[PDB]
Design a protein around this ligand. Structure first.
Ligand SMILES: Nc1ncnc2c1ncn2[C@@H]1O[C@H](COS(=O)(=O)NC(=O)[C@@H](N)CO)[C@@H](O)[C@H]1O
Ligand SMILES: Nc1ncnc2c1ncn2[C@@H]1O[C@H](COS(=O)(=O)NC(=O)[C@@H](N)CO)[C@@H](O)[C@H]1O
Ligand SMILES: [Cl-]
Ligand SMILES: [Cl-]
Ligand SMILES: [Zn+2]
Ligand SMILES: [Zn+2]
Lengths: 477, 493
């Protein structure tokens, strides 16, 4: 039912002549209605008690400081109620500045808890917005094909991870979804990196940088990840102190029992400062944060390959196609909208050549949900049509004729999100855009070895040329 | 030191059958026999364990056992249990250990220790232990623990010169980090002691890395691997780091669940306040599973853990350069010479003692060429406290004269004529520690040794740029050839 939004405030801050002010304040001072007469109205009333109410227009905490002006010839809060319309009931949720939440036979009734400082800082605004966004939501990722290569014959049908484990290419690491790469598998990773460097990054004029791998909340606040990335983060906590005396109990406990006291260690570490590299590109942005670029400096074309990314993926035993610790080449570009779109197309042309002529794999491209929207809790598609992600996918023969194709890398136009988030300006003042491309080496390896096999004699001439003589593994009895 | 005897004193009783009375005399005979034959086994002349008194009861064959260094009372009582069960439930009354010590120790919370008091000659420990603990060899580990804390309470870091280069002219005296910041080579990252390297600084790192590959790793036949960067408690237990690495690790905690409903409260908090609720997040993460890469080599050893290597497969010569190392160093605002996040090439080798010694020699020879001929820096090397001991909280040297660490140090002219030199890399011989810790064997049954070498790229840069400056025109020809044409940085208004 069409219930109405209602702001309700009880507040208090010798004179009888205030009858020519308060009576007319309900028709002159607070009458600023948008569609019609939608201002603050009917209610009852230096303890000057106010019970005045409002809707979306001329808010009760925007009108309460307007009465601070008129009466000038601190505000203490008593009761605050927000009646929010909702077509159906909603689950109980704890949200700061909310004391009570109740679903009824009408909608949702919130009981907020604010001071005058909280009213000034716009607290009821964000609570409303969030609650309205939860009721608006009260489905699925987007996908459509752009191009696919003609089907190929697939003489190799085995799981490449199984094939790699059997043949001593790699082994499982100690941590969840983690691998140790022996000489052969390492040779494959470095050859993919050499290809991306020589066939893409150098001819396109990209410059190497080293991005930080420990990412703080500050970065993820600016990148928007602080909006919903939490389920997949590997959190990092420093110790509360470096004082050995403080850690002696833990060390002594271990030395006697041969078990590390993980519960006591958790008390002795600080709250998390952030987490391990997740999307890779965000910590780069502190390099350009608050800066203004001269127009001759763009497009800024940069890449990183200096470490591991960590994601707490879904449970189960997987191959190197799905891991909790991975190795990516992050490619980032910044410029005008036109340059960002042009840079993206330059990359597509270089990726096409690589996958067709060097790896000679069967692959496709598809428009999907923007990486940044997915990683902060959202789905669907971006508002601007030029903004979004293009996914690169390839078949894994072992998965069967109907198996799902593996996303092995992406290319994204991010719009002005990052330049806005990190406050990066252009000298001319024209809007800055950015893009990025993530190359997953474990994913390239899953695709290549699933299609081509582990035998150099069956790999394309172009790849084999770039590999050199394959190294030997470490053999055991 | 104290000459006082290490002694063990156990008051206990058995129950290896259904309850009798005093109904067997062979008990008296086997205790006298054990003192003369059984409890002497594994002990030098007259240093065996002794049952010094015994009495019977209702299913209680109570005895007072005594011993020293060998055939310890927690080991000897199971020798007696096997006897008193095959010839015909251990409960402990008291477990006393007297340990020689010069100085008195501040008592601390240690499991299975009821009492600790000073005596003449050393320290007396009354243990709170049962039969499971004795079988587990808990008394042994308590003794090792106390011996470590007694050894530490005596009269820091060791240092002795091995080779030094003839002093060079030092025309550049700027702090290379300040110089690099002013010229747009790098900027500080958001995290404590963290840096973002622009095109110019990254070019330098990559050139060092190429020098190590081409001048060392390739001609010496090293094979690249990729070691894990998130390190688990399992790895650090086997490496010994679990013994005291704690004050300096960046701890890693996974979420307790991926369930988005569990994390809704966190996201909602941020959306309303614009603040990340770090206190609530700490409640929602799991206990730490380990921490970020610290020594780099330990997680490799999971590759060889519990395996046997064929003799034709050694020496095993591998390296890793696949990511970042993280250490919670001492506070203060510093340059790239003192960082919490660094990039190292970890070089590892495994084989026999003589092969490991040889591989160490080969690396030293290649390093000497690099620093003398290519970087052309003023440097030295010195024998120092073994890296693995220092990261366990220990000082001094290993008692095997060949086991230890050689540090490479170089002067930073901005620190002045008397400033401390900077350690920029090391080469270590680690003995059997890692093969033993991870259970790696050799087919021939001969001992397996390993070593490692850590090349810290930030440290190479701090040293090279402090001595040579940031201008390529003043760099050595051999270095300038390898760098190629330096790239432009990103210019700001
Ligand atoms: N758990 C994982 N295991 C292995 N590779 C992964 C994993 N997650 C992502 N990748 C690789 O990283 C690429 C880009 O990751 S992404 O989430 O889609 N997008 C981003 O993070 C962007 N910032 C670009 O890197 C993917 O195409 C995939 O190849
Ligand atoms: N906090 C740090 N910042 C930068 N570089 C470091 C830091 N700590 C160590 N290194 C580099 O890593 C090298 C070896 O580190 S070590 O602690 O001495 N020893 C080890 O951990 C051994 N496993 C060898 O890697 C040092 O010589 C130094 O060059
Ligand atoms: Cl990130
Ligand atoms: Cl480590
Ligand atoms: Zn990105
Ligand atoms: Zn090492």
């Amino acid at each position: 039912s069409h219930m109405k939004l209602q702001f309700n405030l009880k507040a208090y801050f010798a004179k009888d002549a205030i009858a020519a002010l308060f009576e007319e304040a309900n028709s002159t001072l607070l009458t600023r209605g948008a569609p019609e007469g939608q201002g603050a109205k009917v209610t009852e009333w230096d303890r000057i008690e106010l019970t005045l109410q409002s809707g979306r227009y001329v808010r009760v905490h925007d009108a309460i400081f307007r009465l601070r002006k008129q009466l000038a010839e601190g505000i203490e809060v008593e009761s605050f109620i927000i009646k929010v319309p909702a077509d159906h009931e909603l689950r109980m949720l704890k949200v700061p500045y909310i004391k009570s939440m109740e679903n009824i036979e009408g909608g949702i009734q919130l009981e907020l808890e604010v001071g005058e400082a909280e009213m000034k800082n716009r607290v009821p605004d964000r609570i409303l917005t969030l609650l309205e966004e939860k009721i608006e939501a009260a489905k699925a990722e987007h996908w459509n094909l752009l191009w696919q290569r003609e089907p190929m014959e697939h003489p190799f049908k085995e799981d490449p991870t199984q094939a790699m484990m059997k043949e001593g290419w790699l082994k499982r690491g100690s941590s969840r979804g983690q691998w140790i790469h022996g000489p052969q598998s390492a040779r494959i990773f470095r050859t993919f990196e050499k290809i991306v460097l020589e066939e893409l990054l150098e001819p396109l004029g990209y410059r190497e940088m080293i991005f930080p791998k420990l990412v703080t909340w500050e970065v993820w606040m600016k990148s928007g990840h602080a909006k919903g990335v939490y389920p997949e983060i590997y959190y990092v906590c420093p110790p509360q102190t470096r004082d050995p005396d403080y850690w002696e109990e833990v060390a002594d406990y271990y030395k006697v029992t041969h078990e590390v006291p993980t519960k006591l260690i958790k008390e002795k570490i600080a709250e998390p400062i952030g987490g391990m590299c997740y999307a890779q590109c965000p910590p780069f942005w502190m390099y350009v944060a608050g800066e203004t670029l001269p127009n001759e400096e763009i497009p800024v074309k940069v890449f990183d390959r200096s470490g591991t990314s960590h994601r707490y993926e879904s449970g189960g035993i997987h191959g190197i196609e799905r891991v909790d610790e991975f190795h990516r080449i992050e490619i980032v570009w910044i410029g005008t909208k036109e340059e960002v779109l042009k840079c993206a197309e330059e990359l597509h042309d270089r990726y096409m050549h690589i996958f067709n002529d060097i790896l000679d794999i069967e692959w496709r491209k598809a428009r999907v949900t923007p990486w940044f929207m997915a990683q902060e809790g959202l789905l669907g598609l971006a508002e601007e049509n030029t903004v979004g992600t293009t996914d690169y996918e390839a078949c894994l023969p072992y998965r069967g004729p109907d198996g799902e194709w593996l996303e092995f890398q992406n290319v994204s136009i991010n719009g002005d999100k990052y330049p806005k988030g990190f406050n990066v300006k252009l000298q001319s003042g024209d809007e800055l855009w950015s893009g990025c491309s993530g190359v997953g080496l474990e994913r390239w390896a899953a695709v290549f070895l699933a299609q081509k096999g582990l035998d150099p004699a069956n790999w394309p001439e172009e790849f084999r040329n770039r590999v050199g003589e394959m190294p030997k593994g470490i053999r055991f009895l």
